[PDB]
Amino acid sequence: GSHMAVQIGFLLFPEVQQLDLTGPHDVLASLPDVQVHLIWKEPGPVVASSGLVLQATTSFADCPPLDVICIPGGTGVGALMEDPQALAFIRQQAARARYVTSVATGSLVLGAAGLLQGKRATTHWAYHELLAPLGAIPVHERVVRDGNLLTGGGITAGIDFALTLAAELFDAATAQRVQLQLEYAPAPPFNAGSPDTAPASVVQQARQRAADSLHKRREITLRAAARL
Amino acid sequence: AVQIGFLLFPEVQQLDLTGPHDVLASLPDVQVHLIWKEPGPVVASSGLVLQATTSFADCPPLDVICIPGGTGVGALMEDPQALAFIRQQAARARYVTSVATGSLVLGAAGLLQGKRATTHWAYHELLAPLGAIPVHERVVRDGNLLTGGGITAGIDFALTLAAELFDAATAQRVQLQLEYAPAPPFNAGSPDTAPASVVQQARQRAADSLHKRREITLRAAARLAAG
């Protein structure tokens, strides 16, 4: 549909990991035929896990029908997995969206909404055991695609799959041009973004420090699965 | 606590800032500031609204200052108040950093004279008039000055900063906890690797910005020369 706008919506919730959202937001908002939304129960300030304040732009009720929905992750996912209004919104939008996507533990929210049953998916590495009880077929890849579902565990996975989205919504030339326009050329100085590549001591520390969060998130996950 | 400040200005390219912000805010014993003339809402180039936390007047002496880029850089390069603030902080800061065309703001402030630096590829020709030695690399370091052209270069140099402020184990722990593991599906993030037509088309899209930014740059340079 040429210059018909593509409506792209990010769920913006308390204690979101903001970079999960702000990366794909800035990539996709650089496209002339995209209209991005930051969605919560009402417009207004929403505090990210770091204390950085974002502003939601639309309520659930006023959000237009989305062509792309994206659920970020972060600490705030635990509450969101048992928020019936938010889960109903997500389900409603996902029913007609061209693409359904998530970053990090945002896929656990998709799971809680019933959208991963029998689907290949990933999540943040520390929480990957929580995919199967939500019906997912867990896959360890940076971005996992199953039909129109795209999930990625890493904090910037949405930047990467945003380029895939741009290519399919528009054309490869449009995705490459956004990459060049923004000069997205990552080159980390360390190779510790996976438990399979970080030093053993670093993995040990991260695993130990995440244990209480995983324990609670499992309890939440089992209730969410029971409701499905 | 380590005092870390990002300049948050109208029409900023928000990801330039929000990437390194989320990395550095994950560290122990840091305090991260979003700095503008007064606290309150600041609208990014995409329309996304951010909230400045700290005025120029109230900002503590920073250990790290970071100037992001975006459309709003043009105005900043001819904003004496902003340029003075940046100089005052840079005089004391352990690290002075920028992303994308934020290095042109450092340049306009007189902070790149004789310094190796980079900027967004489409604006790279504007570094030498500001006294810099242009270097075509993703992150360029000259002493305690770190500049990177690409939109996420601050994520990468933030991990370097984390390692030097704390230690490499701490930086790696943050990388693992955030699961920062980029894997782009295209290889067009450099004018050396993008298709020719894509280079041409991106340049055409930037051309009026560059034209204006060139004019601004030559004015900023001439103001420095009179100093």
Contact map slice: A 198-227 vs B, CB within 8 A: 198-199, 201-203, 205-206, 209-210
For residue A125, give how far its alpha carbon lies from the nearest alpha carbon of chain B (Å). 7
Tokens 């867990």 belong to residue: A138
Contact of A22 with B48, CB cutoff 8 Å: yes
CA-based nearest residue to A20, from A92, A88, A87, A101: A101
Please answer yes or no on whether A167 and B186 come within 8 Å at the CB atom: yes
How many contacts (CB atoms, under 8 Å) link A and B?
A: 224
What would you report as the CA-atom Rg of chain B, rounded to the nearest whole angstrom? 17
CA-based nearest residue to B152, from B180, B124, B111: B180
Structural domains for chain B: 1-227 (3.40.50.880)
Please answer yes or no on whether A180 and B197 come within 8 Å at the CB atom: no
Q: Provide the experimental method for this PDB entry.
A: X-ray
Residue A113 vs residues A74, A100, A135, B154: alpha-carbon distances, Å: 17, 12, 11, 35
CA distance B221 to B109: 9
Q: Does B146 touch chain A (CB under 8 A)?
A: no
Tokens 């204390």 belong to residue: A51
Contact of A115 with A91, CB cutoff 8 Å: yes
CA-based nearest residue to B142, from B192, B98, B104: B98
For B147, the 3-state DSSP assignment is strand
CA distance A117 to A111: 7
CA distance A179 to A160: 10
Please answer yes or no on whether A186 and B13 come within 8 Å at the CB atom: no
For residue A81, give how far its alpha carbon lies from the nearest alpha carbon of chain B (Å). 20
Tokens 């030097």 belong to residue: B164
The amino acid at B45 = S
For residue A95, give how far its alpha carbon lies from the nearest alpha carbon of chain B (Å). 27
Instruction: Name chain B contacts of A175, Cβ cutoff 8 Å.
Output: 185-186, 188
Chain A residue with the nearest C-alpha to that of B155: A188
Contact map slice: A 68-87 vs B, CB within 8 A: none
Strand-strand pairing, A143-146 and A137-138: unpaired
Contact of B180 with A194, CB cutoff 8 Å: no
Contact of A46 with A14, CB cutoff 8 Å: yes
Tokens 């040429």 belong to residue: A2
CA distance B172 to A76: 24
Please answer yes or no on whether A25 and B48 come within 8 Å at the CB atom: yes
Instruction: Name chain B contacts of A154, Cβ cutoff 8 Å.
Output: 178-182
Structure tokens at A25: 């937001």
Instruction: Name chain B contacts of A190, Cβ cutoff 8 Å.
Output: 159, 163, 168, 171-172, 175
CA distance A12 to A29: 16
Q: Which residues contact B213 (CB under 8 A, 6 or more apart)?
A: B73, B74, B101, B104, B123, B126
For residue A117, give how far its alpha carbon lies from the nearest alpha carbon of chain B (Å). 25
Residue A211 vs residues A110, A170, A202, B41, B97: alpha-carbon distances, Å: 22, 42, 14, 37, 35
Please answer yes or no on whether A177 and B168 come within 8 Å at the CB atom: no
The amino acid at A201 = S
Long-range contacts formed by A96-99: CB under 8 A, 24+ apart: A96/A65, A96/A66, A97/A66, A97/A67, A97/A68, A97/A69, A97/A148, A98/A6, A98/A67, A98/A68, A98/A148, A98/A169, A99/A67, A99/A68, A99/A69, A99/A148, A99/A149, A99/A150, A99/A165
Contact of A90 with A71, CB cutoff 8 Å: yes
Chain A residue with the nearest C-alpha to that of B171: A190
Tokens 């989205």 belong to residue: A165
Chain A residue with the nearest C-alpha to that of B53: A52
CA distance B51 to A133: 39
Structure tokens at A138: 């867990």
Structure tokens at A204: 């040990």
Beta strands in chain A (DSSP E): 6-11, 34-39, 44-47, 53-56, 68-71, 99-103, 120-121, 137-138, 143-146, 149-152
Please answer yes or no on whether B51 and A53 come within 8 Å at the CB atom: yes
Tokens 């690797």 belong to residue: B193
CA distance A136 to A227: 15
For residue B220, give how far its alpha carbon lies from the nearest alpha carbon of chain A (Å). 24
* Half-sphere exposure for A79 (CA within 13 Å, toward CB): 8
